[PDB]
Amino acid sequence: PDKKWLGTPIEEMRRIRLPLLRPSANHTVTIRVDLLRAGEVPKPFPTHYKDLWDNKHVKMPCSEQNLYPVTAGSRWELIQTALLNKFTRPQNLKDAILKYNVAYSKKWDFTALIDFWDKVLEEAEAQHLYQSILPDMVKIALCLPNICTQPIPLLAAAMNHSITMSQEQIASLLANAFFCTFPRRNAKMKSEYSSYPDINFNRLFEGRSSRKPEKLKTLFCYFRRVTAAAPTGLVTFTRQSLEDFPEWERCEKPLTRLHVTYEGTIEENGQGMLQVDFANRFVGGGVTSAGLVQEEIRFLINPELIISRLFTEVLDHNECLIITGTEQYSEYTGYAETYRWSRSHEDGSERDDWQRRCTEIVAIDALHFRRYLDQFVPEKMRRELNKAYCGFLRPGVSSENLSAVATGNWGCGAFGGDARLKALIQILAAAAAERDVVYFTFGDSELMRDIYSMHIFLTERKLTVGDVYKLLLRYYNEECRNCSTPDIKLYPFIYHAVESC
Ligand SMILES: Cc1nc(C)c(Cn2c(=O)n(Cc3cnn(C)c3)c(=O)c3cc(S(O)(O)NC4(C)CC4)ccc32)s1
């Protein structure tokens, strides 16, 4: 009568044996594979720090080439000198950060950091922060040359490359990003990293949004956890760029199974499934600044995702980022202006043979539409199909070894996407990639019923991916191409076109 889900029961949805982990031309591995053991902290490979200061690698703060005019001085030595002081007041942390960021002393606002420490936290919580958490963060950040001994390659445009690193290595790099130590990543007029996302956390410290203390509580929850007890797993970051896209009009593949619900979440009810991150082209969006929607929330509760911003170049139309192994450290309530940190989370996910949590997330960026009717243009529809297809396709893996896709309203709200069209686009891309779909409508029960009714209508009539794509081309041609102001909606159009043919 008032069903919370529709279609295939979620228990019938798919939730393989891994080859030996080793470095290769397309795979950077920063730990000792021969010494990888369950419950043991991974050993870095190589044993001693090796540096690369070039256009193809991350510029490390501990590099001997990280210099500053004084006679060129060592910025790493200045970083150590600045951070190894007693912090008793928020001004001390501000002053420390600015000693090696002198050019931004008038541009960087620290209001949110000062208000969190002085006006949000109770006396005992502020004391625990500066007596235990901040000194423990400084120590793991300053351990960077002994932890991250191998150069980290940039996951540049058109590269099909993977990075497997430890959760411990990520914690050292993230503590550095908090203390804003990454060089060449700050200038507004920078050229070298203009197409890369921000990594240093300075924009998290600015202004008076009520959401900043919530972001800070979520990040300090993570930092408290990883400095008290070193995490033992690995995380893989894969940049995927497809060369060959399907000729959608000719696709003879039938639709796959659907589970659609207005209750639940991707991270809780999509366990063991490929989880979609409704990404911005610069991965993580405004996680280190003001943004607090779907992507930023996932990046806060699974902070290991944030390090993708260090080495992931802006995604092109034919690219996506696949992150395997991130751990959930926090629980939350609300969304956007109502987001609140709830408590610490003990991730119960099992680990695979590479010691990675069994959590696979794909970042796929939807297009932003200035006008509503722009999304119905064939080129724009083909773009969204190819994007979702790239995120879902696992070249070399057979259908029976592919889990269902756990997704929802991709590119909705601010980006101007039509939920009914985007749902069809994802259903079609999942069909071409031969995966089943688990779709979350986040409280919209009417959308759940419409997606279900459309999917069951097309399935019963045995319409292929090609048949559905051709119907989308007809809708543009009949109702959008000559439209000046649409007159009829997409789903009624589809039912009419099929039932009257
Ligand atoms: C059962 C519910 N109801 C509401 C209102 C909810 C909050 N919420 C919401 O509002 N939106 C906007 C929206 C879009 N379409 N609609 C209709 C709303 C979401 O996108 C959304 C996404 C997720 S999620 O499962 O992706 N998990 C993360 C946030 C990544 C970690 C969770 C909650 C969300 S969850």
Curated annotation (Swiss-Prot):
Its EC number is 3.2.1.143. Keywords: Acetylation, Cytoplasm, DNA damage, Hydrolase, Mitochondrion, Nucleus, Phosphoprotein. Changing N280A: Reduced poly(ADP-ribose) glycohydrolase activity. Ubiquitously expressed. It comes from the Eukaryota. Residues 150-335 are annotated as: Catalytic. It catalyses: [(1''->2')-ADP-alpha-D-ribose](n) + H2O = [(1''->2')-ADP-alpha-D-ribose](n-1) + ADP-D-ribose. One of its GO terms (molecular function) is poly(ADP-ribose) glycohydrolase activity. The keyword Hydrolase applies. Poly(ADP-ribose) glycohydrolase that degrades poly(ADP-ribose) by hydrolyzing the ribose-ribose bonds present in poly(ADP-ribose). PARG acts both as an endo- and exoglycosidase, releasing poly(ADP-ribose) of different length as well as ADP-ribose monomers. It is however unable to cleave the ester bond between the terminal ADP-ribose and ADP-ribosylated residues, leaving proteins that are mono-ADP-ribosylated. Poly(ADP-ribose) is synthesized after DNA damage is only present transiently and is rapidly degraded by PARG. The PIP-box mediates interaction with PCNA and localization to replication foci. This is Poly(ADP-ribose) glycohydrolase. It comes from Homo sapiens. The chain holds residues 449 to 963 of 976 of the full protein.
